[PDB]
UniProtKB/Swiss-Prot annotation:
Protein name (record): Virion DNA-directed RNA polymerase
Origin superkingdom: Viruses
Family the entry assigns: Belongs to the phage and mitochondrial RNA polymerase family.
Span of the entire protein shown here: 2751 to 3500 of 3500
Compartments (UniProt record): Virion
Coiled coil regions in record: 27-60
Species this chain originates from: Enterobacteria phage N4 (Bacteriophage N4)
Length: 750
C-alpha cells in the first residue's frame, strides 16, 4: 500500500540504517525491527562503552546526538546543530578539542539507534510484519541503501571542508507538480500586485540577525515555464546533500545565506548570549573548527503545503539516476583538461619562447577573489590536472583566459548570497540603447522603473499591442547580455549599435528605388534617353552599397535573405525606430470581435500582425551578426572568411519551425520560448570548440549566469514570464533584469 511505501521511506532511508551493516549481519538487522526490547538492549550496552571513552565530555556527546536524531525525523533545527558524527566527535562550537573525543564508528551506531525510537508506533508496526513475511524482499531493499551510501561517502571523504558539513541520512523527496512556495520581503512583494500568491504565514527569524519583515507565499497548481522546476538545476556535484568543496546546502531550501567576514563575526558573539525564534540559524564549519558562514532555516510546518512525495521505490530510482548524471559531467571536465595539455605541448615543441604567453592556474594567484575560488575547486579535477602536467601545474593561454573574466568589470555582488546584479553604470548604458533602437513610446511601457506593465494598460485593444512588442524586446536584450558575458567590452556595443542602425536604415531606402527601377527599365525599351538616366542611377546606388561597412554580410546573402523577399511601405517604420506605432497599424487590421477580446484573443498565423512580429525578430538578428562580425575581425585578428564561418553556426531560419501546439490555446509566447532555446544550444556547442578555457572556468569561478540553483528559493528571468504570458513585471527594475545561464555543458543537457 501507499502507506507501507512511506513507512519504508522513513525507516530505511531517513534513519541511515545502512550504517548497521558494518558490525551486524543482515539477519540481525531484521531482528531489531521485529523486537523493541532488542533496540533498548543495544542502546544500554552502547552507551556504557562510549561513556568510558568520552569521560567528562559524555554530557555534551549525548545532548548533540539526541538533537541530531530530532532533525533527521521531525525536521526540527535546534541551536548550533551538528550535521554528522564527524563534527560531533570533535565537539565543534562547544569546546576546544584536538581530535576525536570518542570513536566515530561507535557514535554513528548510537545516533541511528536513537532516531529509530522517534518513529511513530503505527509506523513501526508496519515494518515489523514486513521483516517477517518478506525476508527476501526486505534484504534486497536494504542492500540498495548500502550501495547508495558508499557513493556519497566516496565523494565526501575527498575534502575535509565537505566532510564536516554533509547531512547524515539524506534521501531525496519531490514536491507536487505545479505548486510553488517562496519566501519574499513584504514591502517589495506589495508593489508587484501579483494575483497568484497567497500569504500563509510570517517569518520570525532568530534574535542574532536583524532584518525586515518577511513572509511565506504559496501558489496553487498552474502551468510553469519549462526547465524551471522539477530538477535541481545545479552545475556542481553534491555529496551528502551539500556542495562539494564549499559545504553549502543544495538538497533543501533555505531563506538565505550570509558569507561576509565582518557580518559573520557580528552574528557569532550575538548567539553566545542565547537564541530565540522559530527559525534558528545553522552554521558552516571550517577545517580548523572556525565558522565561515551562516544560513537561514525554514519552518518544517510550512513544508506540509507542498504535498511532498515519499515513495521509497520511486525515490531510490531518482537517487541513482542522478548520481550517474553527476559522474558523466565529471568525466567531461577531465577530457577538457586533456585537450588543454595537448595544445600546450605543441606550442612548446615548436619553439621554447612560446611559454611567455601562459599562466599557471594552480600556482600563486595575485587576484584575491580569484584565488579563493581556486582553493575550493573540486578535488577530483585537481588530481587529474596534476597527473598530466605535474606538481601544482596548470598552464592556459593568457588571451583565452582574459575573455573568461570579462564579466567582473560590469557585475557586482556575490552569487552564493544571491544578490548579484549589474552595476549602475551598465544599466544606464543598456537602457539608452533600447530607447534608440525601439520606439520612445515602447520604452515608456516596457522599462518603466516604478510600475509594472499590467498597471499601465487600461484598454482591451492595448493588451494585444503590448503583448506583441515584448517578444522583440526580449530577444534584443538577451543578445546584449550574452555577448557581454563572452568577453565583448561594454563600450564597444554602446558606440556600434547606433552606427549599425544608421547603415542598415539607409539600405532599405536606397534599395527601394533599385527594387522598382527594373520596372522602368522594362518601360525604357526605346529611346536611349530613358536608358541613360536609369543606367547611371542604378550603378551609382550599387557603388554606395559597396562602401558600407556591413557589405561583406550582404554578399554572403544571409543579410538580405528576407530584405528582398518582400517590400512594403509600412515596414519603413521598423527601420526608422517606431516599432510601437508599427504594431498599432497592424493591430487595426484585425476583426472587431478579435480586437476587443483583450488577453483572451487568439491570434492566427495567417494575420498580418503575426508576420509583423517575425519581421521585427529578424531585424534584431540584423544587428546581432553585424556586431559579432566586427568583434572577430577588429580585436580578434581573424580572416574575413573565418569570421563568417562562425556567424553562420549561431543563427537559424525561423520559417522552418511553426508552432505545433493545440488550438484554442494561447501559444504565441510559448512558441518563441522554444525557438530561442534551440539557438542557445548551437551557441553552447560553438563555445566548446573555440574556447576550451572558458568552458572549464565556467564551472569553477562563480559568476552571474554561470551557476544555476544555489538552494535559494526559485527566481525567474526575462525568458520565464515571456513563456507564461504574465504581465505583472517590467524589464527595467528589480526582477526581469536577469538573463538565462550561459554554462555550455549545462545547456546541452538541460
Amino acid at each position: 500500500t501507499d502507506t507501507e511505501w512511506s513507512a519504508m521511506h522513513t525507516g530505511l532511508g531517513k534513519t541511515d540504517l545502512a550504517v548497521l551493516r558494518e558490525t551486524m549481519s543482515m539477519a540481525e538487522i531484521r531482528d531489531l525491527l521485529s523486537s523493541s526490547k532488542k533496540v533498548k538492549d543495544e542502546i544500554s550496552t552502547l552507551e556504557k562503552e562510549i561513556q568510558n571513552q568520552a569521560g567528562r565530555n559524555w554530557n555534551l556527546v549525548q545532548k548533540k546526538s539526541k538533537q541530531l536524531a530530532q532533525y533527521m525525523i521531525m525536521g526540527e533545527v535546534g541551536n548550533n546543530l551538528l550535521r554528522n558524527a564527524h563534527a560531533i566527535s570533535r565537539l565543534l562550537g562547544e569546546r576546544i578539542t584536538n581530535g576525536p573525543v570518542a570513536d566515530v564508528a561507535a557514535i554513528d551506531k548510537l545516533i541511528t539507534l536513537y532516531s529509530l525510537e522517534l518513529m511513530n508506533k503505527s509506523d513501526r508496526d508496519l515494518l515489523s510484519e514486513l521483516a517477517q513475511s518478506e525476508v527476501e524482499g526486505m534484504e534486497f531493499s536494504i542492500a540498495y541503501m548500502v550501495g547508495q551510501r558508499t557513493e556519497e561517502m566516496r565523494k565526501a571523504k575527498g575534502d575535509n571542508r565537505t566532510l564536516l558539513n554533509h547531512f547524515k541520512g539524506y534521501i531525496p523527496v519531490e514536491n507536487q507538480q505545479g505548486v510553488n512556495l517562496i519566501i519574499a520581503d513584504d514591502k517589495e512583494f506589495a508593489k508587484l500586485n501579483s494575483q497568484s500568491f497567497t500569504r500563509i504565514g510570517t517569518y520570525q527569524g532568530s534574535t542574532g540577525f536583524r532584518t525586515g519583515s518577511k513572509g511565506y507565499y504559496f501558489s496553487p497548481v498552474a502551468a510553469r515555464a519549462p526547465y524551471s522546476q522539477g530538477i535541481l538545476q545545479n552545475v556542481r556535484n553534491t555529496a551528502g546533500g551539500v556542495d562539494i568543496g564549499t559545504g553549502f546546502t543544495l538538497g533543501t531550501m533555505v531563506a538565505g545565506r550570509i558569507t561576509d567576514k565582518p557580518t559573520v563575526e557580528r552574528i557569532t558573539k550575538a548567539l553566545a548570549k542565547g537564541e530565540r525564534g522559530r527559525e534558528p540559524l545553522m552554521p558552516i564549519y571550517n577545517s580548523k573548527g572556525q565558522v565561515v558562514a551562516y544560513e537561514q532555516s525554514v519552518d518544517p510546518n510550512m513544508l506540509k503545503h507542498l504535498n511532498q512525495d515519499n515513495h521509497f521505490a520511486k525515490m531510490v530510482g531518482v537517487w541513482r539516476g542522478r548520481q550517474v548524471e553527476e559522474a558523466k559531467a565529471q568525466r567531461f571536465n577531465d577530457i577538457l583538461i586533456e585537450q588543454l595539455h595537448a595544445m600546450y605541448e605543441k606550442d612548446i615543441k615548436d619553439s621554447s619562447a612560446n611559454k611567455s604567453q601562459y599562466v599557471n592556474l594552480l600556482g600563486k594567484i595575485d587576484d584575491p577573489v580569484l584565488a579563493d575560488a581556486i582553493n575550493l575547486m573540486n578535488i577530483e579535477t585537481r588530481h587529474k590536472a596534476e597527473e598530466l602536467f605535474g606538481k601544482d601545474e596548470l598552464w592556459v593561454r593568457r588571451d583565452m583566459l582574459n575573455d573568461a573574466l570579462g564579466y567582473r568589470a560590469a557585475s557586482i555582488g556575490d552569487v552564493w548570497t544571491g544578490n548579484s546584479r549589474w552595476s549602475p553604470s551598465t544599466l544606464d548604458t543598456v537602457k539608452k540603447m533600447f530607447l534608440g533602437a525601439f520606439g520612445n513610446k515602447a520604452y515608456h511601457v516596457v522599462m518603466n522603473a516604478e510600475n509594472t506593465i499590467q498597471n499601465l494598460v487600461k484598454d482591451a485593444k492595448t493588451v494585444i499591442v503590448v503583448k506583441a512588442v515584448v517578444v522583440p524586446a526580449v530577444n534584443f536584450l538577451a543578445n546584449i547580455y550574452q555577448m557581454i558575458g563572452r568577453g565583448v567590452p561594454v563600450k564597444d556595443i554602446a558606440v556600434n549599435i547606433p552606427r549599425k542602425t544608421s547603415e542598415i536604415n539607409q539600405y532599405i531606402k536606397s534599395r527601394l528605388r533599385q527594387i522598382d527601377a527594373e520596372a522602368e527599365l522594362r518601360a525604357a525599351e526605346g529611346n536611349p534617353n530613358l536608358v541613360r538616366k536609369l543606367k547611371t542611377e542604378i550603378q551609382s546606388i550599387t557603388d554606395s552599397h559597396r562602401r558600407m561597412s556591413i557589405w561583406p554580410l550582404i554578399e554572403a546573402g544571409e543579410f538580405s535573405s528576407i530584405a528582398d523577399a518582400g517590400i512594403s511601405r509600412d515596414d519603413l517604420l521598423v527601420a526608422e525606430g517606431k516599432i510601437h506605432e508599427y504594431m498599432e497599424k497592424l493591430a487595426n487590421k484585425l476583426p472587431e470581435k478579435v480586437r476587443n477580446a483583450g488577453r483572451y484573443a487568439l491570434i492566427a498565423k495567417d494575420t498580418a500582425l503575426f508576420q509583423g512580429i517575425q519581421k521585427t525578430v529578424e531585424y534584431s538578428d540584423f544587428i546581432a551578426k553585424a556586431i559579432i562580425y566586427d568583434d572577430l575581425v577588429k580585436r580578434k585578428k581573424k580572416s574575413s572568411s573565418e569570421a563568417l564561418g562562425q556567424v553562420t553556426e549561431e543563427f537559424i531560419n525561423y520559417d522552418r519551425l511553426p508552432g505545433r501546439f493545440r488550438g484554442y490555446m494561447e501559444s504565441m509566447g510559448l512558441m518563441w520560448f522554444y525557438n530561442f532555446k534551440i539557438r542557445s544550444i548551437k551557441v553552447a556547442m560553438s563555445m566548446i570548440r573555440n574556447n576550451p578555457v572558458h568552458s572549464l572556468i565556467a564551472t569553477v569561478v562563480p559568476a552571474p549566469t554561470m551557476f544555476g540553483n544555489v538552494g535559494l528559493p526559485i527566481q525567474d528571468n526575462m525568458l520565464t514570464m515571456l513563456a507564461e504570458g504574465r504581465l505583472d513585471y517590467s524589464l527595467g527594475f528589480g526582477q526581469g533584469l536577469r538573463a538565462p545561464t550561459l554554462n555550455p555543458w549545462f545547456n546541452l543537457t538541460h
